[PDB]
Design an enzyme around this catalytic site. Structure first.
Site, PDB file in Angstrom:
ATOM      1  N   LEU A  83      85.723  31.764  11.832  1.00 26.07           N
ATOM      2  CA  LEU A  83      85.986  31.330  13.161  1.00 26.07           C
ATOM      3  C   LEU A  83      86.016  32.518  14.118  1.00 26.07           C
ATOM      4  O   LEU A  83      85.596  32.411  15.276  1.00 26.07           O
ATOM      5  CB  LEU A  83      87.317  30.607  13.196  1.00 26.07           C
ATOM      6  CG  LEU A  83      87.867  30.160  14.519  1.00 26.07           C
ATOM      7  CD1 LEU A  83      86.863  29.254  15.273  1.00 26.07           C
ATOM      8  CD2 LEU A  83      89.184  29.555  14.177  1.00 26.07           C
ATOM      9  N   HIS A 130      82.234  27.757   3.513  1.00 26.09           N
ATOM     10  CA  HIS A 130      81.332  28.801   3.092  1.00 26.09           C
ATOM     11  C   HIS A 130      80.730  28.549   1.755  1.00 26.09           C
ATOM     12  O   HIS A 130      80.628  29.455   0.952  1.00 26.09           O
ATOM     13  CB  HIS A 130      82.047  30.147   3.129  1.00 26.09           C
ATOM     14  CG  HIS A 130      82.611  30.414   4.463  1.00 26.09           C
ATOM     15  ND1 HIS A 130      81.813  30.529   5.573  1.00 26.09           N
ATOM     16  CD2 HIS A 130      83.886  30.472   4.906  1.00 26.09           C
ATOM     17  CE1 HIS A 130      82.578  30.685   6.643  1.00 26.09           C
ATOM     18  NE2 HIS A 130      83.837  30.627   6.264  1.00 26.09           N
ATOM     19  N   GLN A 132      76.384  30.460   8.456  1.00 27.65           N
ATOM     20  CA  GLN A 132      77.712  30.929   8.133  1.00 27.65           C
ATOM     21  C   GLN A 132      78.516  29.889   7.402  1.00 27.65           C
ATOM     22  O   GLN A 132      79.314  30.230   6.557  1.00 27.65           O
ATOM     23  CB  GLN A 132      78.434  31.317   9.437  1.00 27.65           C
ATOM     24  CG  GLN A 132      79.734  32.027   9.250  1.00 27.65           C
ATOM     25  CD  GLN A 132      80.670  31.819  10.432  1.00 27.65           C
ATOM     26  OE1 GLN A 132      80.896  30.707  10.890  1.00 27.65           O
ATOM     27  NE2 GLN A 132      81.243  32.891  10.895  1.00 27.65           N
TER      28      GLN A 132
END
Length: 316
Positions: free
Chosen positions: A97, A205, A254
């Site tokens: 983030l 992830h 990401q």
């Protein structure tokens, strides 16, 4: 007389660094904090400052709230740094983030647009895997190769893989809950000092986030992106990017690939930068960076005095 300032990087924290009452002191000291939260609140349509100050805890810890809360906190601190006379860092990096905060502070993304975007990011990530089916786990004391091997052996058809490469012997894995547990147990079997679930439901992830990535890609295509004015080293590939669509790609990738934090810190240090400012609440990144390099210096920025101290350190 002239003193060449120390080169420095800003590092922006993400998930895990939120806590009730964060920035309360800075919020008393610096009007820009409340103004920043007001901007975020206008974008979100609820009072974000009130949520962060008073909670409840459980609320703040839900992804759809944590993400805009931390983006706002990180940006507020950056704005206080600038207000107090702080110069631009040489490079920025954010952890997950935090990368959005870096991009806002580098001038690539409009803050209020980013607030809305990370709310969506949180919402989509929360929805990607049914409740209970995903997990993350921290492994301390094994290297990435050892952990990759473990994950391959533990997977047995499920997903489990390195998710955050946080420090040299600290890695978070992510995937299906059962597989994460199997992998953590194998890590202990192979000599890990710690191999424990982290208190998150969302297996970030890793490929389980692909449904979220697909959704976020639609939103990210619509948001205006300018070239960053300070290099932002992306998590997914450990490089900076100037082109909007390449930045979009990096942000979407990401979600499904590991956060390469140790390589990011090593990249920054290889450039001669050994002073890091943690531009957000908590000291989680300082903990990681100090483990990566005990000679690095990481300065907190969570009060006016700390900010002024950090600024002064650059020339003293």
């Amino acid at each position: 007389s002239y003193v060449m300032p120390q080169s420095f990087a800003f590092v922006f924290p993400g998930q895990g660094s939120q806590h009730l009452g964060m920035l309360a002191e800075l919020g008393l000291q610096q009007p820009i904090v409340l103004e920043t939260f007001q901007q975020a609140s206008s974008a979100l349509a609820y009072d974000l400052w009130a949520l962060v100050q008073h909670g409840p805890q459980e609320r703040l810890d839900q992804t759809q709230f944590t993400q805009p809360a931390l983006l706002t906190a990180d940006v507020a601190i950056f704005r206080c740094w600038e207000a107090l006379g702080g110069p631009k860092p040489q490079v920025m990096a954010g952890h997950s983030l935090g990368e959005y905060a870096a991009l806002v502070c580098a001038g690539a993304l409009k803050f209020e647009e980013a607030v809305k975007l990370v709310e969506k990011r949180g919402q989509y990530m929360q929805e990607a895997v049914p409740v209970g089916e995903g997990a993350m786990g921290a492994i301390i004391g094994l290297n990435e190769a050892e952990i990759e091997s473990i994950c391959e052996n533990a997977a047995l058809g499920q997903v489990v893989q390195p998710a955050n490469l946080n420090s040299t012997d600290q890695t978070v894995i992510s995937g299906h809950s059962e597989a994460v547990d199997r992998a953590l147990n194998m890590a202990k079997t192979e000599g890990a000092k710690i191999a424990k679930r982290i208190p998150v439901s969302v297996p970030s992830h890793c490929p389980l986030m692909q449904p979220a990535a697909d959704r976020l890609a639609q939103d990210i295509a619509k948001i205006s992106i300018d070239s960053p004015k300070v290099p932002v080293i992306h998590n997914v590939d450990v490089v900076d990017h100037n082109e909007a669509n390449i930045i979009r790609g990096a942000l979407i990738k990401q979600l499904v690939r590991p956060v390469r934090w140790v390589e990011t810190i090593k990249y920054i240090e290889e450039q001669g930068i050994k002073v890091f400012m943690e531009c957000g609440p908590d000291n989680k990144l300082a903990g990681l960076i100090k483990r990566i390099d005990r000679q690095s210096e990481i300065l907190p920025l969570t009060t006016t005095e700390l900010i002024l101290t950090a600024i002064k350190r650059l020339t003293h």
